[PDB]
Amino acid sequence: ATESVYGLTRYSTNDEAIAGVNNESSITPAKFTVALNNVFETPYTFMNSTATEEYKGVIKLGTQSEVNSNNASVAVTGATLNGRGSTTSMRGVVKLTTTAGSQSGGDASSALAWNADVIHQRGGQTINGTLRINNTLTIASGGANITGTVNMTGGYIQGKRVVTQNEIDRTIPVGAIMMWAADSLPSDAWRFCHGGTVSASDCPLYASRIGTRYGGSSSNPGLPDMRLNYIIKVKE
Amino acid sequence: ATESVYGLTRYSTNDEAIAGVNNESSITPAKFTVALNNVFETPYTFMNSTATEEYKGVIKLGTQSEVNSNNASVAVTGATLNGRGSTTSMRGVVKLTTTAGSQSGGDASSALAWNADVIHQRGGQTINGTLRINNTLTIASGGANITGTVNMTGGYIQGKRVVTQNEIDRTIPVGAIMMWAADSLPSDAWRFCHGGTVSASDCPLYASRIGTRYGGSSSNPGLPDMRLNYIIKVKE
Amino acid sequence: ATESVYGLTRYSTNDEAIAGVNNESSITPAKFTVALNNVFETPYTFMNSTATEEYKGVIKLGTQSEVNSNNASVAVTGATLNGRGSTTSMRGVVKLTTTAGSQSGGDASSALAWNADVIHQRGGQTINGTLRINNTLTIASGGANITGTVNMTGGYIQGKRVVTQNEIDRTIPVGAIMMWAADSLPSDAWRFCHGGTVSASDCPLYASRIGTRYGGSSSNPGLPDMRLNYIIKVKE
Ligand SMILES: [Cl-]
Ligand SMILES: [Cl-]
Ligand SMILES: [Cl-]
Ligand SMILES: [Cl-]
Ligand SMILES: [Cl-]
Ligand SMILES: [Cl-]
């Protein structure tokens, strides 16, 4: 057999079926299935969102220095509120003192309490000690009740000069003689002119002014004897 | 035909082509294509980032108690600033009072204002009422102008004792007789010794001291008749 | 050859092997492998976590208005602490003043310092100027030492009336005559009754009361001549 004309043919072996180049034999069903098996089978807007008027946020604690400087941003604490003591130049917190002229527990930021021991303008109070006033005292009504001695440079009552003891002798001097209408004398400033003596120590002005003019001695100067009665002024 | 030698062959059927075990027939093109189709076709560093000096952050509101204790961490509010009232032991805020000795609206944390009604050391003021001083008053200049009566234990002007009315009789006692140079008397303390009487009620000391020595009666005691003129002192 | 019976066969061409419909030829190994190649080869709980008592958080800065209103939530700054000035109606911060009656640097929220120039109740102080008191002064001990003149409506020492100069003439009037025991006179209130004259300008009361009764002239009125000696009271 050939491609061209008919004739005899044998069957291919298994080896020929697999090695499919032999052109001189024919393929049986059994070697279609042999031959197939070589082919078929092979943190900024946190910290920048600050506290303000308008909006809430975050806040730095003021140092004392910042608190005292009136810093409009920082926070005031218990400690820096306490630490900002009032002074004469800076608004601040104070302790009260009820004793004028004393600080309260050594604190310079002490102010006088409502009930401090001051004298006020309404009256009815007591100063428990002395007082000095450097110019005129005017008492507008009700006078003065004074325990102890008043010393004054001058004195007038309703425009009339007050009399003092040194003036007594000018009005009626020791040594004056008058008469007397009664039986007894009410004071020893005067004595009867019935002779006898007075004591120079009892009557020092009589002794100096009159001496022994009427007898007696220097210690016991004599009185005039003028015997109504006469009387003589012997002492102040 | 065989594998070994040449000879006759028939063609396989379709069924034989598919069931490829028959070794005794040959495969045509038409049954290559039949047989193929059985094979080919089958929250900590929030809350721990706190407010401080140095750094901003977060803050607890102080209770009053913490504010008053000077807590250095918490925040002061309007309410706890207001609530921290000054006392004698603790720095704080105050109301002002212009009236010494009165709290302002019942507030114990009241301090005297700059213009409270106090007496100061500079002068020129008025106390509208009484004043008591428990020891010596010194007026250093300008004296005193006193409306009303001064009562004093003692009085001196420039070191001389002030005279009082009870001393008048010692100097010139009722009952004294002197002479007189003028035609009329300027006071009724003295009377002419021209007899007649005085009234005991007008002249009680004359009546007691002299009685009816010179005539008259107890109510109308007689004066001496000594007829310059004589005069007698009849009353203070 | 046929499907049914045996006989002669030729071999298929390559073209027949590929176009596998020819039923009248047989397939060689070489055209199994040709024919196969057409088949085988073809931001709320931030802002709502607020500051409180109990818990930390976030805070709004108080305006002054809120601070002053005692707002219990907002924050106090240096500026609003400073800005909350004490008044009589509102607790606040103060400046101190040591001068009563003056604000410190024009600040209405000025309180008297512990050492302000006030008079207190304990004594020992000085008012450097005048003082007016509108009712009675009581000095409880130690009297008064007064530089300058005291004018008073009335005066008593230990309940006895103080004597004034206008009373002198009532006790012993100008014009009185008495006797005298000494050789010389200690004052010119009295003169010897030895004739001669006094000066009307030296002795105006004698001149008015006595005139020229004893001789002389109106300018130089005569004294009595009564020639112990007589004396006459010529002036106060
Ligand atoms: Cl006698
Ligand atoms: Cl002698
Ligand atoms: Cl008469
Ligand atoms: Cl009688
Ligand atoms: Cl003479
Ligand atoms: Cl004449």
SS3 sequence of chain B: CCCCCCCCCCECCHHHHHCCCCCCCECCHHHHHHHHCCCCCCCCCCCCCCCCCCCCCCCCECCHHHHHCCCCCCECCHHHHHHCECCCCCCEEEEEECCCCCCECCECCEEEECCCCECECCCCEEECCCEEECCCEEECCCCEEEEEEEEEEEEEECCEEECEHHHHHHHCCCCEEEEECCCCCCCCCEEECECCECCCCCCHHHHHHHCCCCCECCCCEECCECCCEEEEECCC
Closest-CA distance of chain B to residue A223, Å: 18
Tell me which residue range forms the domain holding C105.
94-120+127-132
User: Does the residue B100 lie in any domain?
Assistant: no
Beta-carbon separation of B133 and C135 below 8 A: no
User: Does the residue B118 lie in any domain?
Assistant: no
CA C13 to chain centre: 132
Could you tell me the distance, in angstroms and rounded to a whole number, from the CA of residue C218 to the centre of ligand 6?
4
- CA atoms of C232 and C215, how far apart (whole Å): 15
Torsion-angle region of A198 (φ positive above 0: left; ψ -120 to 50: alpha; else: beta):
beta
Question: Residue type at B182?
Answer: A
The answer to whether C140 touches B134, Cβ cutoff 8 Å, is: yes
- CA atoms of A216 and B12, how far apart (whole Å): 212
State which of C132, C152, C185 marks the end of a domain: C132
Angle between helices C29-36 and B29-36 (to 10 degrees): 50
A127: closest chain C residue by CA: C121
Q: Are strands C110-112 and A190-192 parallel, antiparallel or unpaired?
A: unpaired
Beta-carbon separation of C92 and B93 below 8 A: yes
Spell out the SS3 assignment of chain C. Answer: CCCCCCCCCCECCHHHHHCCCCCCCECCHHHHHHHHCCCCCCCCCCCCCCCCCCCCCCCCECCHHHHHCCCCCCECCHHHHHHCECCCCCCEEEEEECCCCCCECCECCEEEECCCCECECCCCEEECCCEEECCCEEECCCCEEEEEEEEEEEEEECCEEECEHHHHHHHCCCCEEEEECCCCCCCCCEEECECCECCCCCCHHHHHHHCCCCCECCCCEECCECCCEEEEECCC
Contacts of B35 (CB under 8 A, 6+ apart): A29, A32, B17, B18, B20, B27
**Hey, what are A153's tokens?**
């440079």
- Mutation target to probe the B interface, by most B beta carbons within 10 A, among A44, A77, A118 is A77
Q: Which of these, A180, A233, A231, lies nearest to A205 by C-alpha position?
A: A233
Q: What are phi and psi of A94, to 5 degrees?
A: -135, 155
Contacting subunits of A (3+ beta carbon pairs below 8 A): B, C
Beta-carbon separation of C162 and A157 below 8 A: yes
Q: What is the DSSP string of chain A?
A: --SSS-----BPPHHHHHSTT--SSB--HHHHHHHHTTTTT---TTTTS---SS-----PBPPHHHHHTT-SSSBPPHHHHHHSB--SSS-BBBEEESSTT--BTTBSSEEEBTTSSB-BSS--EEESS-EEESS-EEE-SS-EEEEEEEEEEEEEETTEEBPBGGGHHHHS-TTEEEEE-SSS-S-TTEEESBS-B--TTT-HHHHHHHTTTTSB-SSSBBPPB---EEEEE---
Give the C-alpha distances (Å, rounded to integers) separating C26 from A17, A40, B6, C16.
14, 21, 14, 10
- Mutation target to probe the A interface, by most A beta carbons within 10 A, among B52, B135, B157 is B157
Beta-carbon separation of B78 and C81 below 8 A: no
B231: closest chain A residue by CA: A179
- CA atoms of A128 and C123, how far apart (whole Å): 5
For residue C11, what are the β-bridge partners?
C26
CATH of the domain at C183: 3.90.1340.10
- Domain match, C198 and C186 both: yes
- CA atoms of B17 and A210, how far apart (whole Å): 201
Number of residues in chain A: 236
- CA atoms of C18 and C199, how far apart (whole Å): 192
- CA atoms of C198 and A213, how far apart (whole Å): 29
The answer to whether B50 touches B58, Cβ cutoff 8 Å, is: yes
Question: Where does chain A break, by residue before each gap (C–N > 2.5 Å)?
Answer: 42, 227
Beta-carbon separation of C148 and A148 below 8 A: no
The answer to whether C12 touches A3, Cβ cutoff 8 Å, is: yes
Q: What are phi and psi of B38, to 5 degrees?
A: -90, -10
- Domain match, C72 and C107 both: no
- CA atoms of B67 and B75, how far apart (whole Å): 8
> Contacts of residue C119 in chain B, CB cutoff 8 Å?
118-121
Number of residues in chain B: 236
For residue C164, what are the β-bridge partners?
A162
- CA atoms of C91 and C83, how far apart (whole Å): 12
- CA atoms of A195 and C178, how far apart (whole Å): 19
- CA atoms of A129 and A149, how far apart (whole Å): 16
C92 C-beta neighbours (distance < 10 Å), count: 23
Question: Residue type at B224?
Answer: P
Could you tell me the distance, in angstroms and rounded to a whole number, from the CA of residue B181 to the centre of ligand 3?
14
Could you tell me the distance, in angstroms and rounded to a whole number, from the CA of residue A220 to the centre of ligand 2?
8
- CA atoms of B44 and A187, how far apart (whole Å): 108
Could you tell me the distance, in angstroms and rounded to a whole number, from the CA of residue A216 to the centre of ligand 1?
16
The position carrying tokens 């976590």 is C49
Q: Any CB–CB contact under 8 A between B145 and chain A?
A: yes
User: Does the residue A230 lie in any domain?
Assistant: no
From the list A39, A53, A135, the residue facing C40 with the nearest CB is: A39
Could you tell me the distance, in angstroms and rounded to a whole number, from the CA of residue A221 to the centre of ligand 2?
9
Question: Residue type at C48?
Answer: N
Question: Residue type at A227?
Answer: R
Q: Which of these, A117, A115, B132, lies nearest to C121 by C-alpha position?
A: A117
Beta-carbon separation of A81 and B94 below 8 A: no
Ligand nearest the Cα of residue C197 is: 5
Beta-carbon separation of B53 and A76 below 8 A: no
Residues with CB under 5 A from ligand 4 (ion): B 217-218
Closest-CA distance of chain C to residue B199, Å: 19
- CA atoms of C105 and C97, how far apart (whole Å): 9
Could you tell me the distance, in angstroms and rounded to a whole number, from the CA of residue B171 to the centre of ligand 1?
15
A123 C-beta neighbours (distance < 10 Å), count: 16
> Contacts of residue B186 in chain C, CB cutoff 8 Å?
169-170, 173, 209
Could you tell me the distance, in angstroms and rounded to a whole number, from the CA of residue B194 to the centre of ligand 1?
27
Number of cross-chain residue pairs from A and B with Cβ atoms under 8 Å apart: 386
Question: Residue type at B133?
Answer: I
Rg (CA), chain C: 71
> Contacts of residue B75 in chain C, CB cutoff 8 Å?
51, 59, 75-76
Residues 31-70 of B with CB under 8 A from C: 31-33, 36, 40, 47, 50, 58-63
Spell out the SS3 assignment of A165-209. Answer: HHHHHHHCCCCEEEEECCCCCCCCCEEECECCECCCCCCHHHHHH
Q: Which of these, C195, C194, C188, C200, lies nearest to C233 by C-alpha position?
A: C188
Number of residues in chain C: 236
Q: What are phi and psi of B176, to 5 degrees?
A: -70, 145
For residue A157, what are the β-bridge partners?
A160, C152
User: Does the residue C139 lie in any domain?
Assistant: no
The answer to whether C219 touches C199, Cβ cutoff 8 Å, is: yes
The answer to whether B116 touches A121, Cβ cutoff 8 Å, is: no
Give the C-alpha distances (Å, rounded to integers) separating A61 from A73, A77, C38, C49, C222.
9, 7, 91, 19, 105
The answer to whether A126 touches C123, Cβ cutoff 8 Å, is: no
Contacts of C146 (CB under 8 A, 6+ apart): A150, A151, A152, A153, B137, B138, B139, B143, B144
Q: Are strands A137-139 and C131-133 parallel, antiparallel or unpaired?
A: parallel
The answer to whether A178 touches C233, Cβ cutoff 8 Å, is: no
Q: Any CB–CB contact under 8 A between B218 and chain A?
A: no
The answer to whether A116 touches A99, Cβ cutoff 8 Å, is: yes
User: Does the residue C34 lie in any domain?
Assistant: yes
- Domain match, C49 and C27 both: no
A137: closest chain C residue by CA: C131
The answer to whether B81 touches B99, Cβ cutoff 8 Å, is: no
User: Does the residue C155 lie in any domain?
Assistant: no
Beta-carbon separation of A210 and C166 below 8 A: no
**Hey, what are A80's tokens?**
């820096």
Beta-carbon separation of C111 and B115 below 8 A: no
- Domain match, C34 and C71 both: no
- Mutation target to probe the A interface, by most A beta carbons within 10 A, among B99, B146, B191, B229 is B146
- Domain match, C24 and C83 both: no
Residues 98-127 of B with CB under 8 A from A: 99-104, 109-112, 116-119, 123, 125-127
Could you tell me the distance, in angstroms and rounded to a whole number, from the CA of residue B170 to the centre of ligand 5?
26
User: Does the residue A16 lie in any domain?
Assistant: yes
Number of structural domains (chain C) is 4
- CA atoms of B20 and C174, how far apart (whole Å): 194
- CA atoms of A97 and A106, how far apart (whole Å): 11
The answer to whether C181 touches A205, Cβ cutoff 8 Å, is: no
Could you tell me the distance, in angstroms and rounded to a whole number, from the CA of residue A179 to the centre of ligand 4?
26
Q: Which of these, B136, C132, B29, lies nearest to A146 by C-alpha position?
A: B136
Closest-CA distance of chain B to residue A99, Å: 10
Beta-carbon separation of A123 and C139 below 8 A: no
Contacts of C17 (CB under 8 A, 6+ apart): B29, B32, C27, C31, C32, C34, C35
**Hey, what are A136's tokens?**
């005129």
**Hey, what are C120's tokens?**
């207190």
User: At how many Å resolution was this determined?
Assistant: 1.9
Question: Residue type at A197?
Answer: T
Beta-carbon separation of A62 and C75 below 8 A: no
Q: What angle do CA B201, B205, B211 make, to 5 degrees?
A: 85
Q: What are the b/e assignments for C129-159, b being 16+ CB within 10 Å?
A: bbbebbbbbbbeebbbbbebbbbbeebbbee
User: Does the residue A173 lie in any domain?
Assistant: no
Ligand nearest the Cα of residue A207 is: 2
Q: What are phi and psi of A165, to 5 degrees?
A: -60, -35
Could you tell me the distance, in angstroms and rounded to a whole number, from the CA of residue A172 to the centre of ligand 5?
15
Question: Residue type at C61?
Answer: L
- Domain match, C218 and C230 both: yes
Contacts of B210 (CB under 8 A, 6+ apart): A181, A182, B175, B221
From the list B81, B100, B134, the residue facing A126 with the nearest CB is: B134
**Hey, what are A105's tokens?**
């527990």
